[PDB]
């Protein structure tokens, strides 16, 4: 009886907040981790929402597993209203000439291929019912050149490509496909890097015109807006959630 | 006690639906017309909301009047949470070579100067409290070249300029300034141009990849999202509400 959303992730960072936002809006939420040991955290991470959450172990780089997991969800729930491609990694080296090819391939596999696989098998099901929403997560680096994050940015540019391409292809099938482009977001990972003193908050805050960092809630709200049933006419769009970064 | 929004318009088309959207979200709404006679329509257009509506006569091309009206609103309500620059006109002729300078000037006056005047005086007040949101209405023609709508497109390009410029300028002051870029929207005006048979609905809706027209609610939802208290980190952005038009 509830709308159903699959998030690739959900246990930390943006993904966890995305899970919370959909739960607060009466969705059944499917969350994932590569690590089965995370399933037992659910009652404690999501106190009052336990009954509306389903766990799946999933590595998005494993195409067969992506197909298997999405099939399982569709069989069990009879619906897949929303896919959020949250899974993503940044292996931030130095200058381009010093970057590791192995790092690039890992980012390609997770950020591009993972998102492609999830889209590919979700759309197989969404096609059949002529409805659904996909929200991909890009970055400001997916729309601009960002020193020391060139390779990450390249993968996030590719994500925008998958978004716009699929949007135009599925537009007449009533499926909305959009992306968000976050600036620098204060996740747990970043918060502890600020807390350990190796990074000043004000130092990296200054990157955005609003002179503050983004929050996981900022991102979750944008994603929710693009995914909910009241989005009838927004598709192929990349929503900047960046305190004005891309407007300069 | 309620958040307060000024809409340049409110009696027809997109502006009326914007009015309705903010009213449903517990705002006090200031709505305008150039025509004082429209005030008497309020209990009939907005049956259950009249206690939360204030009418002001306003021509946005009159800078003096814009300053007067915004001053009166701030004096009476002690707040101005949101400005929506809805007022706008399109005077379509033929090819560029055939266009009338008087038409261009009229569109410049209403679309560019009117939006500028309202921004100018709203920001004088918002600046003082370091909070507020402005949503401007651009168009797909503000982001692309559209035969037969070149001059209109030019004004809506200029609207984006004011949007991004002011966003960066006021970003550190806690004020969010964004725009929406609608495709072709089925307003009362269009609905009768379809009803008269001078245009087929399928004919003009085919320009959007979604193969349908936008609705006034589509636009209102987008504007509300960019304007509400939960937008903390989106500024300088142009949200396309265009059935995928700009993604091709
Ligand atoms: N943080 C930022 O400032 C920022 C800025 C722009 C864009 N983004 C993007 O936003 C998204 C979320 O970022 P975040 O900072 O919230 O990440 P995070 O806190 O590091 O969390 C990463 C999430 O991705 C999952 N994941 C990683 N690799 C996976 C794989 N191969 N298969 C399945 N799941 C995988 C993780 O699950 P397990 O570890 O439990 O397996 C975890 O849920 C990413 O696409 C990221 O690139 C982040
Ligand atoms: N309809 C579309 O397909 C479309 C597409 C892209 C963008 N837009 C933009 O969306 C906005 C609304 O369009 P719409 O189609 O909803 O318009 P509409 O139905 O023609 O209504 C026009 C509104 O603008 C007001 N207005 C016009 N000139 C004014 C002036 N000089 N001073 C103060 N108010 C003035 C009118 O108020 P009174 O007549 O009561 O004075 C009315 O509220 C415009 O900026 C338009 O350019 C529309």
> How does DSSP classify residue A51?
G
* Helix, strand or coil, per DSSP, at residue A248: coil
* Helix, strand or coil, per DSSP, at residue B8: coil
Instruction: Tell me which H or E stretch contains A239.
Output: strand A238-241
**CA distance linking residue A133 with residue A123, whole number of Å:** 9
The closest of B9, B55, B1, B47 to B27, measured between CA atoms, is B1
B234 at A interface, C-beta within 8 A: yes
**Cα of A18 vs its chain's centroid, Å:** 9
Technique that determined the structure:
X-ray
- Phi, psi (rounded to 5 degrees) for B71: -60, -45
Structure tokens at B247: 């993604």
**CA distance linking residue A179 with residue A134, whole number of Å:** 8
Query: Is residue B74 within 8 Å of B121, Cβ to Cβ?
Result: no
A21 at B interface, C-beta within 8 A: no
Structure tokens at A173: 């099938």
**CA distance linking residue A184 with residue A242, whole number of Å:** 7
What residue of B is the nearest CA neighbor of A223? B225
* Helix, strand or coil, per DSSP, at residue A209: coil
How many residues are there in chain B? 248
Spell out the residues 6+ positions from residue B153 whose beta carbon is closer than 8 angstroms to its own: B139, B141, B142, B144, B145, B146
Query: Is residue A202 within 8 Å of B202, Cβ to Cβ?
Result: no
B148 is a catalytic site residue: yes
Residues from chain A that touch B167, judged by Cβ atoms under 8 A, are: 209, 244, 247
- What are the angstrom distances between the C-alpha of B117 and each of B5, B18, B114? 16, 20, 5
Query: Is residue B200 within 8 Å of B190, Cβ to Cβ?
Result: no
> How does DSSP classify residue B215?
-
End-to-end CA distance of chain B: 45
List residues bridging with B179 in a β-sheet: B136, B238
Distance from CA of A110 to the nearest CA of B (A): 24
**Cα of A168 vs its chain's centroid, Å:** 20
| Side-chain half-sphere CA neighbours of A196 within 13 A | 7
Question: Is the Cα dihedral A176, A82, B177, B42 positive or negative?
Answer: positive
> How does DSSP classify residue B108?
I
B218 at A interface, C-beta within 8 A: yes
Q: What is the largest CA-CA distance in chain A?
A: 53
Final resolution, Å: 1.9
Spell out the residues 6+ positions from residue A28 whose beta carbon is closer than 8 angstroms to its own: A2, A3, A4, A5, A52, A53, A54, A77
Query: Is residue B153 within 8 Å of B142, Cβ to Cβ?
Result: yes
Instruction: Tell me which H or E stretch contains B162.
Output: helix B150-170
Structure tokens at A57: 């172990």
DSSP characters over B46-65 = STTTGGGEEEEE--TT-HHH
- What are the angstrom distances between the C-alpha of A7 and each of A16, A74, A75, A135? 9, 14, 17, 10
The closest of B242, B13, B213, B15 to B144, measured between CA atoms, is B242
Burial environment of residue A128 by CB neighbours within 10 A (0 to 12, 13 to 18, 19 or more): exposed
Query: Is residue B187 within 8 Å of B216, Cβ to Cβ?
Result: yes
Query: Helices B150-170 and B114-129 meet at what angle, rounded to 10?
Result: 10
B246 at A interface, C-beta within 8 A: yes
Q: Which domains are delineated in chain B?
A: 1-248 (3.40.50.720)
Convert A164-192 to b/e letters by CB count within 10 Å (16 or more is b): bebbbebbebbbbbbbbbbbbbbbeebee
Of the candidates A237, A240, A248, the beta carbon closest to that of B234 is on A240
Ligand 1 centroid distance, CA of B228 (Å): 28
- Phi, psi (rounded to 5 degrees) for B203: -55, -55
CB contact under 8 A, B244 and A210: no
* H runs (alpha helix) in B182-215: 188-195, 201-205
Determine if ligand 2 sits within 6 Å of the CB of residue B110.
yes
Distance from CA of B175 to the nearest CA of A (A): 9
- What are the angstrom distances between the C-alpha of A27 and each of A10, A48, A52, A121, A128? 14, 13, 7, 21, 21
């Amino acid at each position: 009886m509830k709308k159903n959303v699959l998030i690739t992730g959900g246990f930390k960072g943006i993904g966890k907040q995305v899970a919370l936002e959909f739960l607060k809006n009466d969705y059944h939420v499917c969350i994932t981790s590569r690590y089965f040991e995370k399933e037992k955290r659910i009652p404690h991470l999501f106190s009052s929402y336990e009954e509306n959450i389903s766990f799946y172990q999933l590595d998005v780089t494993d195409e067969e597993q992506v197909n298997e997991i999405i099939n399982k969800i569709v069989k069990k729930f009879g619906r897949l209203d929303v896919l959020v491609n949250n899974a993503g990694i940044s292996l931030s080296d130095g200058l381009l000439t010093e970057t590791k090819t192995t790092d690039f391939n890992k980012m390609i596999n997770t950020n591009i291929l993972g998102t492609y696989f999830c889209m590919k098998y979700a759309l197989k099901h969404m096609q059949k019912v002529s409805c659904g929403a996909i929200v991909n997560i890009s970055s400001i680096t997916g729309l601009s050149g960002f020193p020391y994050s060139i390779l990450f940015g390249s993968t996030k540019h590719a994500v925008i490509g998958l978004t716009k391409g699929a949007a135009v292809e599925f537009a007449d099938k009533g499926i909305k496909i959009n992306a968000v482009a976050p600036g620098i977001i204060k996740t747990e990972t970043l918060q502890k890097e600020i807390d350990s003193g190796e990074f000043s908050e004000d130092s990296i805050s200054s990157i955005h015109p609003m002179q503050k960092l983004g929050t996981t809630l900022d991102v979750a709200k944008g994603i929710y807006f693009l995914a909910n049933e009241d989005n009838n006419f927004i598709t192929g769009h990349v929503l900047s959630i960046d305190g004005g970064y891309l407007s300069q």
